[PDB]
Amino acid sequence: QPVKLKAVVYALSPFQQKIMTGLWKDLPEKIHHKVSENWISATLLVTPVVGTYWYAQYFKEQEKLEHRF
Amino acid sequence: FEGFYKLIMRRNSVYVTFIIAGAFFGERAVDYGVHKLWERNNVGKRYEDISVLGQRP
Amino acid sequence: RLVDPRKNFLARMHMKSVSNRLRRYGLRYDDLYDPLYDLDIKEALNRLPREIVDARNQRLMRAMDLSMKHEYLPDNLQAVQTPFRSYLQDMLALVKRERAEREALGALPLYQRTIP
Amino acid sequence: AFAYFVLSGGRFVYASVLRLLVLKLIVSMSASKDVLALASLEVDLGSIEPGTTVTVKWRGKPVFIRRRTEDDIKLANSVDVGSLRDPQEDSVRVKNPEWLVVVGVCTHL
Amino acid sequence: DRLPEPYSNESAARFANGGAYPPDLSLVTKARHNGQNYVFALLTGYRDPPA
Amino acid sequence: TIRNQRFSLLKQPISSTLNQHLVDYPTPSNLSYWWGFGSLAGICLVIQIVTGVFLAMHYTPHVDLAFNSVEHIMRDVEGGWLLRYMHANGASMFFIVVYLHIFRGLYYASYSSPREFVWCLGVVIFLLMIVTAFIGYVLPWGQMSFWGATVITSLASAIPVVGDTIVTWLWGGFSVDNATLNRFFSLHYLLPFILVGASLLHLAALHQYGSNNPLGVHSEMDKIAFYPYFYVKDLVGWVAFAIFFSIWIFYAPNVLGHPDNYIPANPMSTPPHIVPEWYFLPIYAILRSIPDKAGGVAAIALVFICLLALPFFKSMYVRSSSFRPIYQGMFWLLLADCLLLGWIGCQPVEAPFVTIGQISSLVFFLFFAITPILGRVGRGIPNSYTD
Amino acid sequence: TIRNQRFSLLKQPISSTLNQHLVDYPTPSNLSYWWGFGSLAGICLVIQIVTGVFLAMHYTPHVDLAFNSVEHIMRDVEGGWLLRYMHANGASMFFIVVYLHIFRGLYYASYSSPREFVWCLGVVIFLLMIVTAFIGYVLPWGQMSFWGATVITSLASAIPVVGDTIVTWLWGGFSVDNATLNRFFSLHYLLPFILVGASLLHLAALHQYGSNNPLGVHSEMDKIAFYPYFYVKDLVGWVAFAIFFSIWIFYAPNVLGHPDNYIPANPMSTPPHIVPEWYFLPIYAILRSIPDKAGGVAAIALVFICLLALPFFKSMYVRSSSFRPIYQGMFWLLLADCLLLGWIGCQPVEAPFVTIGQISSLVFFLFFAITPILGRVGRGIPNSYTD
Amino acid sequence: SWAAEPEMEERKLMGFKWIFLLSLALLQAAYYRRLKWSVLKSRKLVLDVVN
Amino acid sequence: SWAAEPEMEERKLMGFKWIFLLSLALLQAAYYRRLKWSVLKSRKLVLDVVN
Amino acid sequence: TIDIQAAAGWGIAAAAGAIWVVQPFGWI
Amino acid sequence: IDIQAAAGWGIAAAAGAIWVVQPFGWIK
Amino acid sequence: EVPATVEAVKTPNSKIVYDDHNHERYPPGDPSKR
Ligand SMILES: CCCCCCCCCCCCCCCCCC(=O)O[C@@H](COC(=O)CCCCCCCCCCCCCCC)COP(=O)(O)OCC[N+](C)(C)C
Ligand SMILES: CCCCCCCCCCCCCCCCCC(=O)O[C@@H](COC(=O)CCCCCCCCCCCCCCC)COP(=O)(O)OC[C@H](O)CO
Ligand code: HEM
Ligand code: HEM
Numbered sequence A: 001q002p003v004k005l006k007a008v009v010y011a012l013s014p015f016q017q018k019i020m021t022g023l024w025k026d027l028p029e030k031i032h033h034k035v036s037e038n039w040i041s042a043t044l045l046v047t048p049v050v051g052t053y054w055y056a057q058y059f060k061e062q063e064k065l066e067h068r069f
Numbered sequence B: 001f002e003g004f005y006k007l008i009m010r011r012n013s014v015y016v017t018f019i020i021a022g023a024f025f026g027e028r029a030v031d032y033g034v035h036k037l038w039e040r041n042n043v044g045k046r047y048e049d050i051s052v053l054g055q056r057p
Numbered sequence C: 001r002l003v004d005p006r007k008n009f010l011a012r013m014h015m016k017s018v019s020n021r022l023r024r025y026g027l028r029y030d031d032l033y034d035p036l037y038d039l040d041i042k043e044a045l046n047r048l049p050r051e052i053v054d055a056r057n058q059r060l061m062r063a064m065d066l067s068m069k070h071e072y073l074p075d076n077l078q079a080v081q082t083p084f085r086s087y088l089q090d091m092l093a094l095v096k097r098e099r100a101e102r103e104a105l106g107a108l109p110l111y112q113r114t115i116p
Numbered sequence D: 001a002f003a004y005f006v007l008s009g010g011r012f013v014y015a016s017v018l019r020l021l022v023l024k025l026i027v028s029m030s031a032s033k034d035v036l037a038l039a040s041l042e043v044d045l046g047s048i049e050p051g052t053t054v055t056v057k058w059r060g061k062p063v064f065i066r067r068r069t070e071d072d073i074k075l076a077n078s079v080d081v082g083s084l085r086d087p088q089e090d091s092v093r094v095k096n097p098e099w100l101v102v103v104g105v106c107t108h109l
Numbered sequence E: 001d002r003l004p005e006p007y008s009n010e011s012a013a014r015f016a017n018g019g020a021y022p023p024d025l026s027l028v029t030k031a032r033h034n035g036q037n038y039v040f041a042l043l044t045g046y047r048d049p050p051a
Numbered sequence F, G: 001t002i003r004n005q006r007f008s009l010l011k012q013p014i015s016s017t018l019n020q021h022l023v024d025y026p027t028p029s030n031l032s033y034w035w036g037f038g039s040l041a042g043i044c045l046v047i048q049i050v051t052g053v054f055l056a057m058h059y060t061p062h063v064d065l066a067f068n069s070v071e072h073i074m075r076d077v078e079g080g081w082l083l084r085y086m087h088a089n090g091a092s093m094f095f096i097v098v099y100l101h102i103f104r105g106l107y108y109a110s111y112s113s114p115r116e117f118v119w120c121l122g123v124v125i126f127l128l129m130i131v132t133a134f135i136g137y138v139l140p141w142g143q144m145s146f147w148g149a150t151v152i153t154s155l156a157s158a159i160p161v162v163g164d165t166i167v168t169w170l171w172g173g174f175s176v177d178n179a180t181l182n183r184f185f186s187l188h189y190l191l192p193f194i195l196v197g198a199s200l201l202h203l204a205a206l207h208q209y210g211s212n213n214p215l216g217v218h219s220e221m222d223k224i225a226f227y228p229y230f231y232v233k234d235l236v237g238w239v240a241f242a243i244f245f246s247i248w249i250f251y252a253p254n255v256l257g258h259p260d261n262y263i264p265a266n267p268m269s270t271p272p273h274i275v276p277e278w279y280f281l282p283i284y285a286i287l288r289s290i291p292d293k294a295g296g297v298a299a300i301a302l303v304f305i306c307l308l309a310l311p312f313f314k315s316m317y318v319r320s321s322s323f324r325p326i327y328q329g330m331f332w333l334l335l336a337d338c339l340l341l342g343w344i345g346c347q348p349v350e351a352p353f354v355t356i357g358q359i360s361s362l363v364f365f366l367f368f369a370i371t372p373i374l375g376r377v378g379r380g381i382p383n384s385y386t387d
Numbered sequence H, I: 001s002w003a004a005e006p007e008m009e010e011r012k013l014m015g016f017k018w019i020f021l022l023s024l025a026l027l028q029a030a031y032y033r034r035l036k037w038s039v040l041k042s043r044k045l046v047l048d049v050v051n
Numbered sequence J: 001t002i003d004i005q006a007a008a009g010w011g012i013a014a015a016a017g018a019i020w021v022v023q024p025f026g027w028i
Numbered sequence K: 001i002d003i004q005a006a007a008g009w010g011i012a013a014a015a016g017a018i019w020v021v022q023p024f025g026w027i028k
Numbered sequence L: 001e002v003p004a005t006v007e008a009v010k011t012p013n014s015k016i017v018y019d020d021h022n023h024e025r026y027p028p029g030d031p032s033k034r
């Protein structure tokens, strides 16, 4: 079903704008935003993997040492 | 770039021919440059650099 | 109640997080309710006044534009947002009660979802 | 009611034809006559050191041989049968006190 | 022609090498983990056993 | 308007279906690069089919010739090395892309109503992909091929009464032999075409309602045509994927594989380490975490049962993880758990990895057990968080 | 109507397209049993695909094993002789049902406007059928397989500049050998799915306008639903086809072929009577008649050019042979001429058969040369035959 | 003859049974088509046109 | 090592060439996408709604 | 008189593409 | 109409299983 | 009060400001970059 909208949109032609410089514009703010918003998500992804890997290597090392005469 | 535009981009047939020519010549140039880098990086290791080549008794 | 932010600080943090996320886009929590998810939502949306639904659609368009542009609402527009000002839940509850009444008396449903 | 009877008639045949074609396709994947031909034979063996094993060959299946030592038999005759998930004593499995011969394929997969 | 085979079949190879089969070396560096290093280390790594 | 004359050729009956399904199809303007992966998977399927058709021109499905025919493809046919490395690593690219796709769907709750049928068709497609890739991996007839075929055909023996007869029917004999390889070849040519048909049905089901978006909201107010905007976005994705695939093909063609499959199949000796391809490892881990044949097979089936039952859970009316902090966190835990299951599948079956595998399998099933509880509880959020 | 509730399940989105294209599609009520051969063609395609998939599980595409693997199917596979005979005779059945289909189209002028695209798709489908069946006949690797492969792959040598290059590329070498067989087998698995797609496009193009009828008139005023009327009408033809096919399979399995393909391929000797299957005989007679290699290839291509150009010739507005007696006679002459060409193709190249074949090919081409002039002349019939 | 065609007897035994059964099925199918089409074939159509 | 991978040198030359070319293509693709999307991303949208 | 120029341009394009796919420098 | 139908369709399924697979000898 | 869309429709603006987070415009009247 079509939606009934009321809006005014103004647009500039693609050939009247700079195309690429906006990628490296306010880069530190972009990094700020990605880190600040995503640090819990990143912790929940990485910590179980690294913790489990480290514990497995620790277990393997101690087990190898225990069987050594 | 407007002068080059008036010779290459006014007709799509010329533009398409220009694209075909660019593919041909650019791929040849890149091939040549990559082979130059390969030769410069492997001096002395080629089959043609075997000291005794042709000298198996 | 564990869901009440007035009692559980975890619920309070949950509410604050959701409110900040909605405020960034100018969206209301009721705007997240989609007429394609449930037929009861579609019915409730159809019962609402044109002005409420128009404001919802405008907020959705503004949010989609911001999402496309990778930008949030300017902080001055963020200060005047009302993320949990409700317009839909009461109508939706009334619709669900009416459907339950129809089912309890053995009547045919007033609307059905198509089989995809 | 006359028309149901005439129709049931040919529906018998349609069902039979479906079953025949499907079963022919399914059974074509079963073992071929030549595969079943090579399914029976026996071989002989020699001897080995007391404490090592050597695998030998059959249809597509290894066979394990392990002549066990005295302490090996002591170890193999000290396990509770009840605790075993497949209760069986070593004496039943072996026809010789020390020569242990067994098909060497895992019963799991 | 392919390179010649030292033995007529695998059973002959095992009989000539005390029951062990010297594997074909055409893909041996791809058929072992860390293949090139492994082959070099094995060839130059014959020494006395641990106590 | 009355269509007396011909307008755009795109709107003529010759072209109209393609136009309306491919050029003018309305698409939400805020789709991210995470919506590029369906088209990537489509391109991977076409790449696999093209390379496999050309490779089947030189491959001999016989136990006495299969390994040698692969080697002949690598050494003798011109560009053969490229065709083989492209098919073998394109299977891996296909699975990487499809995994990224499935996890976009899980993060945005794209499985929810009205897109349940899309998700179910995707699950069927995933099953088809798994079977296709496995039987394809049998074809070189290396050690890995033979022993993996042995165990997967043996899986049917978990059935008590008729399990053995199914195993021997799958083999075509009392062991994995030439009959197994020949039937696996036919199946390998066939299943890709069924995959194409299933993918087309997947796409049609998705266009019934249109794509979901990163906000998870109704999107009818801000839709734009597929061509050219999402065409050029997917093109950026296609070129980046080409660079990735080329790195794998030309510089690390064997890193995503095991050297054991360069040894011809020996039915006498099982290699000391016997693992499937990397993209099957999580299922391997879930299988081995159960100390029981039937239990393991049942857990493997329960994985797909949970995947199929996911869209039909009574849930809250909020889709995107962008507005669901608890579900979002559970998403990033599930992603870590799946990566752990994959790593565990590569390990020998011994301590401490049995316990870790068991706990990881439990966590994986807890995701699907907990999501419905989350939906039921979160139904009460709008009544408890008042303005 | 406002579709608030669900009515009949067939009208739901899950089955609306199958209801509209297959169940409720309007069909002229006066269609004869001549209109039941498209469905028969489709069932033949399905039979070929299923039997071939199950045959490929036992066939080896190698010159040292192909013949012996075909004999191993006949002898060792349980149900194998039935898989082979169904596939081999199925191929002949496909060609019979497709020839009757084509001649039905020619008698009713089914190729005429608005259904030109239907006819062109049909011609493409016929080409695909010929390539598929030919390469399939090479797989057994008997005498006929090998020498038939040696000729058709040499047809490219008619090209002056690149002809020999094309011949040696198609061969994969300097002779018909293992490379040719392997690439034929790969092409022969792939081509039938392209045939399935082409058939689907064929049916869609036809359903844009609906079927022509034996009166050749506009039929909107007397259309009925395909199911169940034309379903049961087609079922009668399906059962009759089953009886015919069963007679061929069980009582005359090898009378449609030649005994020479039961001899293993010998590149040294050559059979004194090198013939193709009967369904390629008319084409092969038209080829042998021209006394120049190039002229023969040209004539073969001109056959398909004439078939493709038939719908586009300016014609009269009457369709059915029912009301075009002269075109009707031209039809009965063309059909006799095609049966003559097929018989001549089986005859050795020696008098009087050379001249008979030349005259027959001439008449075949005269049919297409004369149809347009008949259309132009008959456009004046309504003015001339007044009240 | 037996060596070339070892499947002849089973094949013949199948052709007799299946042609008898398929002929019965053809009779049924004819009856089914005619029963379904009778409502259309016996219908009386009344129109105003004459020529 | 040469015996196991005799195509290695051709493979590496191809890899260098085509990865360089594909990187150029990726830069062009990014420019193309952003050129086509700039009219949307820079658009100014005015709507009635506030909260 | 532009269709002829279009035909000539596209013919040049087709020739350029032919020499580019097949690259017959060792045959000319 | 719900329990009787379920019983009837279960009986039909069991009969069809006995007809497709014919294990006359598994009655042990 | 008058809503913003009505005011925009009623008052043409020759001093249009486009969104600049992703793209910065060339000065108005610049030659096209085609
Ligand atoms: C014989 C004639 C030449 C034949 C080759 C024709 C094609 C040449 C390829 C293009 C080369 C020029 C590339 C752009 C140069 C400009 C670099 C630049 O400044 O970046 C551009 C954007 O350009 C790009 O993004 C780079 C795209 C390059 C595409 C890759 C070229 C491929 C080379 C092909 C060579 C053939 C070898 C390959 C053969 C197979 C900035 O755009 P804006 O942000 O809109 O403006 C910024 C404002 N200001 C101007 C002040 C800086
Ligand atoms: C694979 C399955 C894993 C099984 C896990 C075992 C069982 C655990 C299940 C629970 C999932 C674990 C992860 C849950 C925590 C996720 C992290 C989180 O939500 O913290 C938020 C903090 O707010 C909260 O949500 C805390 C709430 C605590 C829980 C209170 C429960 C009451 C609410 C019940 C509602 C139920 C439905 C909710 C739907 C979302 C994030 O805040 P923010 O991102 O908005 O910004 C802050 C940051 O600095 C910048 O990014
Ligand atoms: C109809 C299309 C296909 C054909 C004709 C085909 C054909 C082949 C052939 C002949 C081989 C053996 C040669 C070799 O090992 O390189 C093979 C291997 C393989 N195929 Fe396919 N294939 C097709 C599609 C697919 C698809 C869609 C996948 C992934 C889902 C796939 C995955 C594989 C895998 C993993 C191997 C083993 C590769 C290796 O280690 O060498 N194929 N295929
Ligand atoms: C060969 C494999 C597959 C192909 C070719 C394919 C293709 C596609 C395409 C083109 C889209 C639309 C564009 C996009 O969202 O990326 C899509 C969407 C989707 N796919 Fe698939 N897919 C495949 C596998 C799967 C699998 C395995 C699943 C889940 C188990 C799945 C579930 C979905 C869902 C839920 C969507 C909707 C996404 C949304 O609206 O946000 N697909 N698929």
Ligand code: HEM
Residues within 6 Å of the ligand: G034, G035, G036, G037, G038, G039, G041, G042, G045, G098, G101, G102, G105, G108, G110, G111, G115, G118, G119, G121, G122, G123, G125, G126, G195, G199, G202, G203, G206, G210, G211, G212, G213
């Ligand atoms: C794979 C082979 C083919 C299949 C499965 C097939 C299938 C069909 C089907 C189902 C129909 C509609 C029903 C009917 O009238 O029969 C049809 C119509 C038609 N087919 Fe085919 N066909 C095939 C090959 C051909 C060929 C080779 C031609 C001619 C060159 C052709 C020309 C036509 C025409 C003209 C019609 C329209 C007939 C009419 O309305 O009177 N077909 N086809």
Ligand code: HEM
Residues within 6 Å of the ligand: G045, G048, G049, G050, G051, G052, G053, G055, G056, G059, G070, G084, G087, G088, G091, G094, G129, G132, G133, G134, G136, G137, G138, G139, G140, G188, G189, G190, G192, G193
């Ligand atoms: C995907 C589908 C198909 C597959 C997998 C397939 C496979 C095979 C195989 C393995 C053979 C060799 C064994 C034998 O000769 O009996 C064969 C032979 C043959 N196929 Fe097919 N086929 C398919 C479809 C078709 C179709 C559609 C046609 C008809 C156009 C056809 C015509 C033939 C012919 C004429 C032979 C030679 C039969 C003989 O004399 O022995 N096939 N096919």
Ligand SMILES: COC1=C(OC)C(=O)C(C/C=C(\C)CC/C=C(/C)CC/C=C(\C)CC/C=C(\C)CCC=C(C)C)=C(C)C1=O
Residues within 6 Å of the ligand: D025, D026, F130, F131, F134, F135, F144, F147, F148, F149, F151, F152, F153, F170, F187, F274, F275, F276, F277, F280, F283, F284, F287
């Ligand atoms: C060490 O062990 C193991 C391996 O080894 C190295 C493996 O690789 C894998 C990898 C396997 C996985 C993940 C699952 C494979 C799943 C399926 C369903 C494949 C089974 C299908 C087969 C064999 C072919 C299907 C056959 C058909 C359809 C017959 C055709 C019949 C007709 C048309 C009538 C696992 C788990 C494993 O633990």
Ligand SMILES: COC1=C(OC)C(=O)C(C/C=C(\C)CC/C=C(\C)CC/C=C(\C)CC/C=C(/C)CCC=C(C)C)=C(C)C1=O
Residues within 6 Å of the ligand: F021, F022, F023, F025, F027, F038, F039, F041, F042, F043, F045, F046, F196, F199, F200, F203, F211, F226, G197
């Ligand atoms: C708005 O819609 C669109 C999308 O957004 C939802 C898309 O995601 C895609 C991309 C989707 C596709 C096609 C990927 C799906 C995967 C498939 C089907 C892989 C199999 C590919 C083949 C062979 C194509 C099948 C189709 C036909 C007709 C066969 C003939 C064609 C060929 C031989 C190539 C496109 C193009 C699109 O516009």
Ligand code: FES
Residues within 6 Å of the ligand: D106, D107, D108, D109, F151
């Ligand atoms: S096959 Fe031995 S434990 Fe699995």
